[PDB]
Design a binder for these strands. Structure first.
Lengths: 65, 218, 130, 82, 71, 206, 82, 129
RNA sequence: ACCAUAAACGAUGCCGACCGGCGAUGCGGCGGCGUUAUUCCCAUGACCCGCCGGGCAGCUUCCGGGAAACCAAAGUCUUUGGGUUCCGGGGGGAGUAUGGUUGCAAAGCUGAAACUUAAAGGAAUUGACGGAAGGGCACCACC
RNA sequence: UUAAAGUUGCUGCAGUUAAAAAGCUCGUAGUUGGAUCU
């Protein structure tokens, strides 16, 4: 119930939920320790261009951007 | 074909024992490796750690023999460590694989902070000690991986520990004393009495007692 | 010398432990029973075994033989004994005063067969060390 | 050993130990009550007495002191108090 | 064993800074004699005039002539 | 013998104990065996409390009756004064006798045909049969033994305090343990005396 | 042992020494589990029940397994008082 | 000579719990020792004890339930601020799931978890697990 | 009179607590059958059976240590904190030079650096050796 | 130059045989000091 844990623990969760790396229902502070590199690498614009059907490989997407 | 010679192998082969944890609960000695091959089997992986040539001087010269250090492990499960010396490297490795299957222990896993999910680290600080080498396992949070030297990292990842802190002491260049020291620390995770293990032990019947009417027919 | 190797002695000992009833003290009879029970090759080995069987059956009658089975060696002696009254059926049992205090705490001071002897009066039971 | 009641020793076992190593310590001495044979007076005497006690009536010795325990004279009957 | 009490801070740090001089790395880099014997004077590089080419002979368990320069 | 009137030591058992000499221990006293001594008398010989010899015997009898297959109990005497009583304990009870020299590796070396896997071990002397004691600490094997006053109690779990030097005392202890294990089972009743005379177990030397 | 949801997350629960509460390990080959038979209190014959005692290997290497069995069985009334 | 009488008692019930014994006699008693043992008993680690009244100083006969792994003193009694409590329980305690650090605070002798609940610092006496 | 130094060695600071057994011995104290001597009697002395307390030692052990030899302390150490003193930091240069100080002096205390070097060193194990001592054997040895 | 170095060690080293405990006792400062008062 400490004010720093409640305040900076909620800003840190909001940013991970906002950039799509966490889930909405997983907004406890202990699921941050269960995050991986690939969860952040999914949210690059290059992989989003490839995964939204704008490109046809992950190398066509970087050269499109 | 396995013709078992012990009272336990006859019970294991005849489907009377359903898990390795019954043999671990009654702390029965395991003298045949086919019990381990029966139980774990398809999920049991080995790594040779070092082939070590040793030399005895003789009247005719010196006999060179070869020492193989084989760590075996079921990932999430159990881990064993066998050492065998022989005059030939292939027989040394096969004998060390048998002897590593034979000395397989369970490892208790725990939680670093709050107990949300499956266990991922050691339950407490455990020290192993073998011939000047001290290895200490310290619990680490979810996802740090193993922070260790490359020798205990093999055994710890085979044991199923997701993430741990480690601290060594002594002459860790001797890979034998540095592998068996961490094996002594992993084997201490069930011997540590923590407050959740404080309940009174309701006793059950030993496998040599419950199946005493099946064992007399053979 | 004439020292019998462990082939001769091993085969003789296992024939003793399996066929003690068929064997005896004559060499030539034991020579004939081993050559039908056992498959033994050329004749000089059959003769050396049967001599050790004779020499061994001579020795079992006098007591124990360490190389052969105890259960069999003891059992034959029993078969080859009842005393009419038991050795524990005594009429006078000589006990100490301290023994009768133990029986008094065992509420068995009311026994008739006891005879409380007096213990010796010198406290000397150790060896004169030096 | 390894399950021995340290609270309740047997009374022949506390008697055996040294006087400070008992559960509660207590002295091995007592006050005797010496009667002089050629007199009527009754004297209080410490059992481990130092310097020699004289019955002031008869002016005779009652106990010469020794290393451990005061040695009475020949013929002095004594009782131990309480 | 070592003193451990709550008012032992002067004994502890004056012992450590006196036993620090028994270390080879501390004595080298905190005395000043080794810096006055270093011909570079603590610099990483230096510059000189080549006086003569000099062949130096290799030490015993191998054999060659190393091509040095007296500068 | 949990304060039951059925199981108390009777008069004839005390008479047999006194006639055989099972109450007289040795000259020395182990510190582990001090619990069973009444007192040391003169001539330096310790007297064993027969009430505690009787109750440790009744505790061992329950440990033998609690094994279903009766051949899984093993009975061992490596010296000649107890070799006959072991062979007749196993004929009346159904145990497995081992007389004479115990082979080092009987309980641990699983390759051999000498390999046995018992569930209980009864031993006539913990000093003479030191080797089957230490091998029971390798295979999780509980151990009853007949212990004198100088006996060491490392790895014995039920220590029957008798005399085991004299030849009558050993035979009487094995006979009375056989009678107790047969009485506690469904066989012979506690009313009549047993048919087997206790001199079948004695070791009569030449 | 238990997580926050309440599952049992453990391979097995090991036994404890009945004399000294130590965890009997997996490779504790000197440890014992021993049944002592229960009798019917009017015939003195084997009822069918028993009383299980487990004792770890260090207690047996100490030589204290005899006294420990004795005071465990004395608490259950299997061995009478004195 | 005997200084730090609580270091004697905690070494005695450490060395006796290792030997598998059921009871320890610790002498002399003290009122710091009784408050330390009360903290251990209320978390299940020792069980009941009896203070023996000599008129000089006490003796305590502690019963032992074999749940204790280690009982230690910290000498000297350092001042521990409430911000410094995490480093001390990182060094001393074997896990974040069990174990205790005993502090003398001005609200009494208490474990490290209660001292956070009373929002108090103090000086450290020792630890048990 | 100075000198104050040694394998000055348990090659092992001091004080304190806890942690296994066993039998001796030395001193003091407390008890206990029975032998002797002071003619009896106590009282003592010499023995004998114990107990207590410090001591000099020894044997033993899966207490636990340790690289091991070994150690009941060299244990109670990564589960690391009882109090306190001196002192070590790879091998040499070197306990050398210089300075200071004590001593008549020899010597004492204190005491470096430049430079050189990848090992030096400790336990344990297998072999190798003899002009070390003990055993067994052969007419390709002797009698 | 920092970590690696628990090879400077407060956390946290070592001193029988590897480097190492003063010949012995006294003794100032320093350091450390038995229970006990709601």
């Amino acid at each position: 119930k400490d004010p720093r844990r409640l305040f900076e623990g909620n800003a840190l969760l909001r940013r991970l939920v906002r950039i799509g790396v966490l889930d909405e229902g997983k907004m406890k502070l202990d699921y941050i320790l269960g995050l991986k590199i690939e969860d952040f690498l999914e949210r690059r614009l290059q992989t989003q261009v490839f995964k939204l059907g704008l490109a046809k490989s992950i190398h066509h997407a970087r050269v499109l951007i | 074909e396995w013709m078992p010679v012990t009272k336990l192998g006859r019970l294991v082969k005849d489907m009377k024992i359903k898990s390795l944890e019954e043999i671990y609960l009654f702390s029965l000695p395991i003298k045949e490796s086919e019990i381990i091959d029966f139980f774990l089997g398809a999920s049991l992986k080995d790594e040779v750690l070092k082939i070590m040539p040793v030399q005895k001087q003789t009247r005719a010269g010196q006999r060179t023999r070869f020492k193989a250090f084989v760590a075996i492990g079921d990932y999430n499960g159990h881990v064993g460590l066998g050492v065998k010396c022989s005059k030939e490297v292939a027989t040394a490795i096969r004998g060390a694989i048998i002897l590593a299957k034979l000395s397989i222990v369970p490892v208790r896993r725990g939680y670093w902070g709050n107990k949300i999910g499956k266990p991922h680290t050691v339950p407490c600080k455990v020290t192993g000690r073998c011939g000047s080498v001290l290895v200490r396992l310290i619990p680490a949070p979810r996802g740090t991986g193993i922070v260790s030297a490359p020798v205990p990292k093999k055994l710890l990842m085979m044991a199923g520990i997701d993430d741990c802190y480690t601290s060594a002491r002594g002459c860790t260049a001797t890979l034998g004393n540095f592998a068996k020291a961490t094996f002594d620390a992993i084997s201490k995770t069930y011997s540590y009495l923590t407050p959740d293990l404080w309940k009174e032990t309701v006793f059950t019947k030993s496998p040599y007692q419950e199946f005493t009417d099946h064992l007399v027919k053979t | 010398g004439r020292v019998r190797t462990k082939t001769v002695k091993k085969a003789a000992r296992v024939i003793i432990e399996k066929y003690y009833t068929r064997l005896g003290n004559d060499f030539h009879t034991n020579k004939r029973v081993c050559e039908e029970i056992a498959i033994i090759p050329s004749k000089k080995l059959r003769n050396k075994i049967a001599g050790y069987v004779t020499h061994l059956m001579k020795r079992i009658q006098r007591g124990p033989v360490r190389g052969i089975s105890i259960k069999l060696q003891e059992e034959e002696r029993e078969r080859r004994y009842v005393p009419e009254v038991s050795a524990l059926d005594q009429e006078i049992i000589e006990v100490d005063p301290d023994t009768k205090e133990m029986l008094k705490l065992l509420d068995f001071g009311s026994l008739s067969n006891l005879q409380v002897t007096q213990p010796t009066v010198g406290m000397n039971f150790k060896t004169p060390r030096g | 050993p390894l399950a021995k009641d340290l609270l309740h020793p047997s009374p022949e076992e506390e008697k055996r130990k040294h006087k400070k190593k008992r559960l509660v310590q207590s002295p091995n001495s007592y006050f005797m009550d010496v009667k002089c044979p050629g007199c009527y007076k009754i004297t209080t005497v410490f059992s481990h007495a130092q310097t020699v006690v004289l019955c002031v009536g008869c002016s005779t010795v009652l106990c010469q002191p020794t290393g451990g325990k005061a040695r009475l004279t020949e013929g002095c009957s004594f009782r131990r108090k309480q | 064993g070592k003193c451990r009490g709550l008012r032992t801070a002067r004994k502890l740090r004056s012992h450590r800074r006196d036993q620090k001089w028994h270390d080879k790395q501390y004595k080298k880099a905190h005395l000043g004699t080794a810096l006055k014997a270093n011909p570079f004077g603590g610099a990483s590089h230096a510059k000189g005039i080549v006086l003569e080419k000099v062949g130096v002979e290799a030490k015993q368990p191998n054999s060659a002539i190393r091509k040095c320069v007296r500068v | 013998s949990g304060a039951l009137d059925v199981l108390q030591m009777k008069e004839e058992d005390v008479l047999k104990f006194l006639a055989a000499g099972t109450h007289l221990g040795g000259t020395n006293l182990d510190f582990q065996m001090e619990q069973y001594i009444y007192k040391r008398k003169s001539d330096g010989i310790y007297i064993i409390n027969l009430k505690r010899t009787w109750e440790k015997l009744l505790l061992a009898a329950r440990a033998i009756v609690a094994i279903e297959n009766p051949a899984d109990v093993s009975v061992i005497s490596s010296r000649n004064t107890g070799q006959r009583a072991v062979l007749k304990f196993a004929a009346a009870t159904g145990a497995t006798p081992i007389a004479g020299r115990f082979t080092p590796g009987t309980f641990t070396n699983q390759i051999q045909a000498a390999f046995r896997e018992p569930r209980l071990l009864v031993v006539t002397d913990p000093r003479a049969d030191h080797q089957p004691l230490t091998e029971a600490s390798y295979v999780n094997l509980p151990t009853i033994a007949l212990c004198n006053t100088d006996s060491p109690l490392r790895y014995v779990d039920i220590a029957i305090p008798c005399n085991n030097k004299g030849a009558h005392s050993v035979g009487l202890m094995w006979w009375m343990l056989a009678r107790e294990v047969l009485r506690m089972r469904g066989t012979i009743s506690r009313e009549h005396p047993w048919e087997v005379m206790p001199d079948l177990y004695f070791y009569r030397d030449p | 042992m238990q997580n926050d949801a309440g599952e049992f997350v453990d391979l097995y629960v090991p036994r404890k020494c009945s004399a000294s509460n130590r965890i009997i390990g997996a490779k504790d080959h000197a440890s014992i589990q021993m049944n002592v038979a229960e009798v019917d209190k009017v015939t003195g014959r084997f009822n069918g029940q028993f009383k299980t005692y487990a004792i770890c290997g260090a207690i047996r290497r100490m030589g204290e397994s005899d006294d420990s069995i004795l005071r465990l069985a004395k608490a259950d009334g299997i061995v009478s008082k004195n | 000579v005997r200084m730090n009488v609580l270091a004697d008692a905690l070494k005695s019930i450490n060395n006796a719990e290792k030997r598998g014994k059921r009871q320890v006699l610790i002498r002399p008693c003290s009122k710091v020792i009784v408050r330390f043992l009360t903290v251990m008993m209320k978390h299940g680690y020792i069980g009941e004890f009896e203070i023996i009244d000599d008129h000089r100083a006490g003796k305590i006969v502690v019963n032992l339930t074999g749940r204790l792994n280690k009982c230690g003193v910290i000498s000297p009694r350092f001042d521990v601020q409430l911000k410094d409590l995490e480093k001390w329980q990182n060094n001393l305690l074997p896990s974040r799931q069990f174990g205790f650090i005993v502090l003398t605070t001005s609200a009494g002798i208490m474990d490290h978890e209660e001292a956070r609940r009373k929002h108090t610092g103090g000086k450290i006496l020792g630890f048990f697990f």
